[PDB]
Amino acid sequence: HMELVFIRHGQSEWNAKNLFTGWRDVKLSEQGLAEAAAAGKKLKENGYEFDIAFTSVLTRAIKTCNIVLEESDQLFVPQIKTWRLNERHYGRLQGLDKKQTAEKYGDEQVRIWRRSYDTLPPLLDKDDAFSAHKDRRYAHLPADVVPDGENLKVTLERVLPFWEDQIAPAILSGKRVLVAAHGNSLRALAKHIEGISDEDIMGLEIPTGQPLVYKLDDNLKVIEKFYL
Amino acid sequence: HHHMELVFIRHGQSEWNAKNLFTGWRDVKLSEQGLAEAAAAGKKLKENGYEFDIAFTSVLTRAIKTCNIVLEESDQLFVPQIKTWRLNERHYGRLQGLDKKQTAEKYGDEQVRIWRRSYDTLPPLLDKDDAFSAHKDRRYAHLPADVVPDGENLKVTLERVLPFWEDQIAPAILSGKRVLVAAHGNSLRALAKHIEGISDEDIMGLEIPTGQPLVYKLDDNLKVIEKFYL
Amino acid sequence: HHHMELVFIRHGQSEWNAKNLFTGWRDVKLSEQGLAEAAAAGKKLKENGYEFDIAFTSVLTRAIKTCNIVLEESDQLFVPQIKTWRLNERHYGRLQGLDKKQTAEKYGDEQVRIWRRSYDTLPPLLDKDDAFSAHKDRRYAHLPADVVPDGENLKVTLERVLPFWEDQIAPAILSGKRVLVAAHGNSLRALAKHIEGISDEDIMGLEIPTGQPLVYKLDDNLKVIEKFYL
Amino acid sequence: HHHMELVFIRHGQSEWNAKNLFTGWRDVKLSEQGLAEAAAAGKKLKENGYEFDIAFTSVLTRAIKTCNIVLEESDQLFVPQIKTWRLNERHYGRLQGLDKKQTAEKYGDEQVRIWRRSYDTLPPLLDKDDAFSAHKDRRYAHLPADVVPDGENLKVTLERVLPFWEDQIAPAILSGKRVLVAAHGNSLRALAKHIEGISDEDIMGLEIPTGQPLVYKLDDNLKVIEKFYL
């Protein structure tokens, strides 16, 4: 039996401003930084040691990862950063005020974009100044894996290969894994690991700043799930 | 070799091709004919000056051995080699090990054509506790069991081939590496579908002959400039 | 930038530097001054347009945190990061955790100077069963025990730094990658000795300032074209 | 099996052995006899139930091909394979490509004994611009030029073999991997000296037969429990 630990990053500066973020590379707020430190201290007090840490390539998640590791006396743990763990891309909604958006397109269309499993947002123009295609951190990837907008379903389709190639093999080799990522990428992993239906997954809550522990059997089936 | 070039090679005849048995993920060896095809392909790559910086292959022996022979015969057995289940042949389900002629007799030509190549229909599945299930092969011991297939068609094969293109092959090309991919009919057809932007309808007619090096000349964005067989 | 550049950053003051203690492999934290030094360096590199493709650091927290601060303050925390024991500070043996002044009072000024600055004089060795021996730190649990030292001089530090230059740092530069190395006084001094071609007799006089980015312009043979501090 | 086992295999006869030519880093092929020795060793490993999780070899074709044959004849060609210059044969300098009798004529009979029986005496070095210099070989193009030697003795061979033990082989064993190492007389001898703790005075007399699997049973600390030829 192996334990697998997830941590979702806390508040960003754009959450505080009520802005859609997606793949925009925004900084944690002071509150979000404290949440990361509190989470690392909790893992330390319960004696959680890690052999490898997986994160996204977005600064708010990487910094959360580093804070959690440092506050639990294991900043030496190897770290792999991957676009496959990025937040869901929000298309042309990125950078927009959620209130101003609901007032422009209506409360109902906004609810769809945020709460529908397989409804894509309005897509971002491929050569927009704030398109991910212009971001150097994706330069080594074929351009067509850089999305112009995602929902949770498409987010899952690109998270899952990283579970299959890196996370699950690490667990099966005996490694104690930390995953430090985002609301929707962690929600995608949880849907797969726990076998949650399409109908139920959009309602699954993953709190920010609270370590989530899975206990898995030799076939990676969930035996225990609890928040630290 | 003025442009960035990518080379594919499909392995030659296997012992089960000669016996007319469905193979799929069963780990059968090359026939002498298939061994000769690999050597002739390596000599052709040598004669035309094809140097590689990395080689990708499946974890099925017939493809790995093809890869090794091609490298040796072109004087570059030192080239680093990555083996991945994601480049395996399609899984043939319960049909693995059966005679193709007897299967066509029992079920009819058209049903056999659908099992051979479909974008929407799976072969009959192989029971997970069968003695020859891939779940029992230690080369997949570090994969979740739900990743190890019980049967696949071309669409499902593509869906597990593509992440390897996204994570390993395409980054290698974009980094400037001259890539060799030595694999199987269906996994190479899956890559070609994505590389060439072929529709779900049209990929059903894409044929890739055994033992003939296939060269793509790609531009800076990995679009096909030219495609030809050596 | 017009040429291929290699950047070194030595971490700033630690909480043990302020208190005049030998540190070695003890995993001490940066002081407030050391943290500010790392931010100022990242700002400098940001202002001068230094982008990195890969970052190398030790497994000691003060160096990793320096590396992370520098990347964050130059808008590139996404850069891949490899941590290795081979970039650790020189192990100071039994002197680790001792006060340098009280050590000089006990053994004399010259002996502490020899321990600090002799190229090939080992410090007194730390017993392998000591609670603060590196053999008990789980970050070295995946290494054979006989590579975990009980004490080091600069000569043996170079002997274990150099393979990491040969296997990882130099191949990265040669592949075209813009490299950051965030480490310690003795491990960077070791790299400098090799890169610059400094004699055994001259290296103990080489100073590497803390928290100041050091830039090597290199040619295609990794020979120093120019060395300057940012 | 019972404990953690590590298997070495020295490649069999090369085409230069019957000509009595010093080989070193020259990339010579296995003879038909050498090919048979590899197949028989793989057959022996299969019969005795030796499964591998990872295989390490040099970047010289005769060792890589031995490694591939051993894996294939034991039904495990899928095993991941890492090729490294650090497992190359000892570089023989200016003696490479020369007859052992013709060497006695140009240097004298006693001087040849020293070059083949002294732990720490270098052979005459090969000029870096020689037609048959390793510096011209593209398999080392991704490495700093000074790791490619102009000639080596066993001591210098051990100095560049040992980091690969420390970085790759021993961490694999310590993680639970069943390791195969397919390499050369002097690089395997270097490994044996370190693993077994053999002195400088005794190691030059250590014989490693060709084509004969060598098995180490190691304990959790990588201490030898038993060493035996299969």
From Swiss-Prot, chain A:
EC category: isomerase
Record's catalysed reaction(s): (2R)-2-phosphoglycerate = (2R)-3-phosphoglycerate
Coiled-coil residues: none
Chain positions of site Transition state stabilizer: H182
This protein's UniProt keywords: Gluconeogenesis, Glycolysis, Isomerase
GO MF annotation list: phosphoglycerate mutase activity
Domain of life: Bacteria
EC identifiers of the protein: 5.4.2.11
Active site: H9 (tele-phosphohistidine intermediate), E87 (proton donor/acceptor)
Binding residues for substrate: 8-15, 21-22, 60, 87-90, 98, 114-115, 183-184
GO biological process, one term: gluconeogenesis
CDD domains in UniProt: HP_PGM_like
InterPro entries: His_Pase_superF_clade-1, His_PPase_superfam, Phosphogly_mut1
The protein's annotated pathway: Carbohydrate degradation; glycolysis; pyruvate from D-glyceraldehyde 3-phosphate: step 3/5
Pfam families, A to Z: His_Phos_1 (PF00300)
HAMAP family assigned: PGAM_GpmA
PANTHER family associated with the record: PHOSPHOGLYCERATE MUTASE
Family membership: Belongs to the phosphoglycerate mutase family. BPG-dependent PGAM subfamily.
Subunit structure: Homodimer.
Functional note: Catalyzes the interconversion of 2-phosphoglycerate and 3-phosphoglycerate.
Name by which UniProt lists this protein: 2,3-bisphosphoglycerate-dependent phosphoglycerate mutase
